[PDB]
Structure formats: structure tokens, C-alpha cells
């Protein structure tokens, strides 16, 4: 154990489990000879790159899974939700940290992964003959996230039994509680609208159902603390 | 001019011939290839990634589908009981179809290499016991019990000491040609067998669930290979 | 000991049929002896699920044109295959000046002349054609619409002022060359419902693969 | 003779294929290329030349057409009033169509680079005052007034000190693809905005006209580029 | 980062259709089964305004010939395309000895044989074809007439003594190669009225571009 | 393009002409040639082997 601090944000965590650096690349910056060398893209250091600790979702036996969209989860929150809106372009990285606080008497397993361009396909009316486009609350669920309804196909017609092909890490309750991931900016472009485009999405599904005998706390507070890495903006409004 | 003699093959259009053809836009400078994370070069990269093996590929009821992903172990199983069983058949139907490996295998006709199945005990942390996971090489018949399985390649897994255990499947080869129905399919016959027995019962103290689930992930070693592309799929683009 | 067959370029080459144009004499179908085919690579059934393994790709594509009559017969007819790059305007009529715009490459070939064949480049302005888009182009009917993936349009027509004398059928094959790909993702296990979205059939949700009776009976 | 196999593409006539063809007059020695002044090599040379921006592109009456060329400023405008406004849209209609840059843009499909708009005060020499010319980057909404415009990229121009002032438009990119009507057009969306406010009123002593005009010239920086020729025109050769 | 697309040679290549010849059987149009087409590069609509950006240019031109029947059909007919350099005499009849003058290059090709294709050079005696001329060749009807810009004449005809058995249509494309240009000038903003002069319509004088309501409403 | 003149023989298919033809499967890597005992290279090898001569070729 030992506590780390980035500004006014002080979280208490374990020494250093095994972190997952998505695709082996580190969220670096974008050099001078890029497409906008005129409007120098200011790189937020001060408070912009600090610890955001979201409304802890509660695990249950019946939980299906949860997902947040990026950078959507923060374009609402704090002084980064200040730059994400009143700025024209954006490129960022993310130190995501997911923790569970449960006793050695609860059991379960959470798969935690990041998926680029996570396009939510709805059910489509049922029989398949309705071309319904997911609402805006499902496409960009804010920092409250959203519950998958069809975890097996990840609400996008794809087997989750294969999601491990993305950066992921496991949260087996009998072995670990904390799970950490480092995401590098990923897109077909060097910069992009931080409001109209969610580069990726954080997925955390219960693969082995939460269980416990009667008496043990029925819910497991999953705390998601995350912070921007070598994030960049350009063109104030 | 210069003397020639056109040879047979002239004017044929081979869907596979990979010569060059005249550019439609000769002046056009296509926008530059920038650096994108995670570039895949050869598909075998993906075959070495672990994907959940739906060993418990039995429940089909729409909202139980999340269960094929993990089978369970409980207090109620007497010492020696068979917990589960499946074959080393990445291509052919069943449990392997859920693994990404299995899915790729479908775009290829022949293949061979060592596999690797890892098990994960996701039960209470207060649980202990032992499992005997045995591999009965191709040809060998499923061991009658836990004792006879104990004489062949096996591993006693004490999910009391280690939460994870990985087993290597030495070799599987889908190359023996079969012309059955009227449709000639290249099938295994190398159905290796992985059996799993309760070496001991599931011991858990008061206050801990009497049922844990286990997830089994699978991937192919680096000695894996594939040959002969064979586009095939039940899911194609609809009208 | 070799592993070249499993490379991306290997996996993806081969000319596959992605399009077929009917130019009947008597018909409800393309009554003006001409046709427009915005280039779609999903035309080859198999293809949609294959490419959707990745998120970003890049490539050139060699197109080959096979034309004849329905009985698969050859005839003394001339043809104009025209390519209207994205941005350029498609011909609205069998006499739209779009047929004459020099900036719309056109290749003329007699039906007898073996298949015409041309290479088209990586059009996209983005650094890569990307299959998925988690946003909207600056509940909306524009979700998942990655625009900058337009390859162009192929306008086909009999040459000449008057209607052609024969019933014609053009087939467009396409070999994908120089393929590079990034960000791999879960193989589509659910049936496809529309060309644009991953929308699946929430009723008919099927297990990824075959099932069995017990986890102990093989 | 020598063995060959004709490949598909044989006999096709590509309007773009740029091979060589047999010379009609093999002996003919065409009269020598002498030196002529001002040779143009690449069109982008012309895109860097300043041409009058018809900002005041409103009068259409035949003999007032010479007015679109220059807008005016007068004593009658109170401090803070909006004098004029236009977008950073070289291709799309309006003010930019008069500039040579805009006109070239029409033979191309995509493009991007920094622009540069220079203003010229052609009023009496005895006049003074200040103007606030602000640029509201793409996406940013026209500032409500002179004050809010004063918080974003702006320039106080004292046509009392300098007769000319040049503003650089950092960047504009016409690359976002739109398939609206049925005709797929490559449009901006990067409509930057240039607003012009009376920072102070127009101060002129007795004997000097209470109205001056300003000419706005425009050109594209050197970082400019164009892609994909697209011959298009309303004016073609008549019968 | 590249700027090759905006070069003159790039801007101008591409074969564009600049001419079409009709040789009907029954007709008022070219009744003698032959035709004369003094080479005009204004045939491609777009072209006139493009070249008129400059005052002086220079180039070679590769011509390609596409011939068939109106339905765009191919036939077993032979053809004589003849080029009468400037100065030489054009054929006045379907049997004018001009058809036989060796100094008038001629290329014979069967309709079936793919398009005939030839390169013609920079004819002009002046150091450059010049689009504008502020004078008269040694109020006059000869103003702006730069003479030394003649590229030649293309005489087309069915081969043989007798009328051809079929209705024919020749199309002449033209790629401009090796283009050099000087003295740039204001893009034509007014509609064209005649091939020879800049004469515009003094009544219909239109603003260079779209207009708006106020210089404050976008 | 480049000038040619097709010579007689063009388009003929000689059952004996041994030129090369386009591969049907360009990517395919055929399974490796391993070592097998007794490889025959030229038939005359077999002509030097003794075989029983049916001199008494009379009983049928």
C-alpha cells in the first residue's frame, strides 16, 4: 500500500499491480510538424490532468455489465469538461483505475477492457425490421455510465467471449480488487471533436456472477478513478 | 516491329492473378499513412490471444447465454466425479466456436500446432480443494474414472494455492481428408480429450458460497499455422 | 514451417465479385441504358464480416470488368465505364454532361476486348478507412456514419446516342492490394440486419456456436 | 517468336492513361521555346496572390457592381457596432467567389491551409478611430457584441496610425464529406468567422468626408494545398 | 505535404472529348461520307475558360480516336483519318487528291482495331500559342485574330470508292502533354458569346459570385 | 506503347510446348518434400536391375 497525488486529488491504492498499457504505446504528445502548426495546441498540465473519481456503481448478482464512452464521461465533468466543450480539437490518453471493495467472502470476476469506436447497436425493434438508432443516452451515457442489456453480444452483435482481444485486465475477487489500464490516443486522425466522437469506451462486465451467503453486504462498490495523459486541445470558442 | 507469339492463357482473367493494372488517377497523392496503435500484420497474432472457451456450451435459453462462458464446481460433487469434458477441436463445432481462434480457423482449410487452455477459479477466496485435469491424447478413450485418468497426462490443481493453472495441449492436426456425404471436408480425427475430475470435494468454511464458477480461456501456441483460405460464413451481408 | 498464407495481404487479395449491373432492353430495371454504382466492398457477401474484424484499414483496389449478355454471350458493343471520384457529380441521365467531364476518368473498351482492368487508390481523406464510428458527423439518424470512406462511383453505359441493341450484364470484381490494418475486434456472431449499423435481432440472439446436452457428454 | 500472354486491360482506352503515342510528323522541328516573362509552373503560385474580396457582396444592380469591392465605415456608427462579417470559406459561395483563390478552388475537390486577409483604409488621410477585427474559430458562434469579441482572437486597428493591417486565418479545411440532396459534395464545416466592430467611432475634422471605404484583399499562405481535379463551370464554350 | 496535383501539366492532362463527327447514310449532315475538322481545343466546354487563365501556352497533344455506330456498335469498316498540317489543302470532295498527298499523314485503322492514337506537336510558328491579341494582322473585323495558332485539320472518311454501308460516329479525344504557360490573367466571370472574342453581354452583366442581404448577415 | 509484330504460331496450343502458365494459388505453400528412401531419377536405373527372364515362356 501507498498513496499517490496529482494536484488536489489524493487516492489511496496498492503498491503497483500489473498495469496494462493498451497496444504497448504510451499516450504521448503530437509533435510540431502536424496539421495545425499555426494554432499551437495548448497541453493542459495544471489541474486538467488529475484524478477524477466517478459515482461508484454497485455490483449485484443480477448486474449485466457497464460501459462508459470516452471522452464523453468527462466532457460533462470538471475543468476538463470545460476544455472538451469550449475547444475545437482534442487528443488524449487515460490512466484508468477500477477498484472493488469486497471481503474475502464474496466471489466474482470482472473483465475490464477498452474498445475503440464502440458503436452501440440496439436490439432493432425485436423481429429485426425496425432501423432504430440508439438514443443519445445510450450513445453517450455521461459519467453515470450505462448497463448493457445484452452482455453476451455486447449490445453490438459481437461475442464478448472474444473481447479479450482488446486491452483488458481481470478482477477476480479472490486474487485482486484493483485493475489498471493506460490508453494511448487512438483514431484515424491526429485530432478530433471531443463531443461528436467517442474515440473509445470503457467496458466492465461481471463474467463470473457476484455471490455471497446471506448476511454479507449484497453490493460491491466499484470505484472508477481515471486521469488524462498527455492530453492536447486546439482552437478556443 | 519486334517478333512475338502469344501463348495459351492470353486474355484470361484469373481472379487470383495478381499482376498490375493501370491507375485510374495518375496524379492523385492519397492522404499519408499516419501512426495508428495496435497494427495487425499476420492473423496468427490473433490466434495466440486468449478468448473465453464456452465449455459449458449447453444453455441456449436467450438470457442464460452468459453462462456458456463459465462452468461451475460445488460442494455437492463427491471425490472423483467428472466435472467436465471437451475435445481439442478448434475448428469443428462446440466449445471452440466461441474462442476467437476457432472463428479464424473457419477461413482456413488445414492447420496444426500446440494449443493452450488456461483455467480460472473465480470462487470465494476462502475455498480450497483439488481438481484433476487430464488430457487423453488422440485415439485414447475417455478415462473410465478419476483413478484411470490419474495414470495419464494429468494435473492436480489446488485452487487453494493458485487461482490459475494453464495446460498445454501438445498437438492437434486437422489434415485427414474425408469425402462423406458428397461434400469433402478436411477433418481432425485428432480429437484429443480434456477431462476434469474432482480430486477432492469442494471445501468451504461457513459464510462462503457452496458454488464457484470457472472460466476457461484458450489460445494457440506460437508453433501454430494455417493453410488454404476458405471464405465461409453463415452471416453474410443482407440485401 | 511457413506462415505466409495467414498474412493480411494474403487473407484479402483475390478478385471477388462485388457488383453486377443489368442493362436490359425491355425493363423496369435501369430503363435508360446506363447505371450508377457507388463503390461498396460489402457486395461480396463474405467480405462484410471479414473486414469488420478490424477498426481501421487501408488499401488500393484493382477492379476488373466482365461484360456480356444474360446467356453469357459476347457481342460487338462498345462501352464506357466512368469513374466519378467522390465529390464529383454522378450522371442523372443517359446524356448528362457528366459523361464528358475529363476529371471523371473513363475507359472505353469493346465487349470483345478482354476485361478492362484498373487500379483505384486509397481515396479517403482520413488516414484510414475506418469501419466503426462512435459519434455523429457535425437519438439521431446520423450515428455511426463515418463519411470519409467514399471510394467513388462507377457509371456504366453503352456508348452512343441511341439505346444499345442488346441486353447487357456488367460484373465488377475487385482485388484488394497493399492491405494494412489496425485495432482488431470481436468477430460478428450475430446476423447482420442493415448495411450501416451493428443493429442485431434482439429476439433471435443465438449462441456463438453449436450446443450440446451436458458439459460431460461429448 | 518470343512468348507472351495478353493480360486484362488489353485494348482499353483510359482517358487518364498517359503513355506515349506515335508522332504524326516525325521529321518536324517545332519552332524553339524562347524566353517569355512571368512563367507560371504550379497553380498554387496564383493562390498566394491577393485579389479583392467582395465582402460587400450585396449590391447586384448592374452599375453598382463596382461596390461589392469595398465596404464603408462612417461617422454614424456608434462605438461597438458591427461593421461587417464573413466566413473563412474560399470555396463555397459568397465573398470568396470574387477572389482569384476562390475561383481556382473550383477545379479542385479537397484543400487546406492558412489564409490571409488584408484590409485597406482608403478614407481621407485626416481620419482616425479604431476597429476591432475578430476571428471566431470554426464552431465558435459570432460574438454577441464588441465586448465578447474582444475576448477572442482580435485586432484593434487604428486606421489613424497604419493605413493597412493584415490578419492571418490560422486554418481552414474543406474535407468533411456530405451526401445531402443526392449529390455528394465535399464541404467545409470549418466556417471560421471574421467579425469587424467599431471599437471607437469615426473621428474626422471639418472638411473631410464622413465616409471612407475599405478594401479587403485575400490570398492563401504558402502552407496551402489542393487535391483532386474537378473541372466544373457555369461558363463553358457556346455553340 | 505534396503539391504535385496543382502543377500545370497535372491540371491539364486527361484526354477530353473535343470533337465528334457524324457520317450518316441518309442525311443532310456530311452527305459525302467524309468530314473536315480544323483542330479546335475549345471543343471540350470546360477548356475555354481554363486555358484563358493565361496569355501564352505551349504543348503537344495526343489524340485518340473512338469510332462506332450511333447505338455504340462496332462494325467491319475500314477508316482513313488524315491530318492536313496547317498550310496544306483540305479535301473538298470524297475523291479530292488531297486524300493521296503523302505530306498529309494518314493512319488507317479498322473499326475493330482499338482506338488509333497519335501525338501531334507544337505547330505554331510563334514561340507560343497565344490566346489574346491586341491588334490586327497586317473598327475592323480582324481584331484579336492571332493567326499563327493553327494546329491543322483532321479529315475523316470511310475508306473505299463507294459510300460506306454503315452509319458512323468518330470521337476525338485529346490529352495535352508537356504544358508550359506564361502571363496569368483574370478568370472569365462573364458568359462567353463567341469563339473569337471576349465580347460579353452588356445587358446581363452579373456579379462574379453569389450575393447576400447585408454585409452583416451570413 | 512498344512496337511488336505477332509471328505465326501465335495462339497455338502445343501439347509439347513446355512454357510456364499462371499459378492458380499464388499464396499457397505446398507441404515440404521430406526424405523418402529409394528415389528414382532416370529410368535407365531400372533397366540395369535383374528380372526373371521367362525363357520357358511356353506353359500358358
Residue numbers in the entry:
A (entry chain B): 13 to 249
B (entry chain C), D (entry chain C): 1 to 239
C (entry chain A), E (entry chain A): 73 to 210, 218 to 297
F (entry chain C): 1 to 60
Sentences from the paper on this structure:
The two-fold opening in the A-particle has a measured diameter of 9.3 Å, whereas the empty capsid has an opening of only 6.4 Å, a 2.9 Å difference. This size difference suggests that the diameter of the channel is linked to the presence or absence of RNA. Over all, these two-fold channels are broader and more open in the A-particle, likely to facilitate the release of ordered RNA, an important feature as the termini of the picornavirus genome retains large amounts of secondary structure. The A-particle shows that the interior surface has large patches of negative charge at the two-fold axis of symmetry with minimal interspersed positive charges. In contrast, the five-fold vertex is lined with positively and neutrally charged residues. This release allows the capsid to expand and open the two-fold channels, leading to formation of the A-particle, in which a portion of the N-terminus of VP1 is tethered to the RNA genome.
Enterovirus 71 (EV71) is an emerging pathogen with pandemic potential. For human enteroviruses, binding of an entry receptor triggers a series of conformational changes, resulting in an “A-particle” that is primed for genome release.
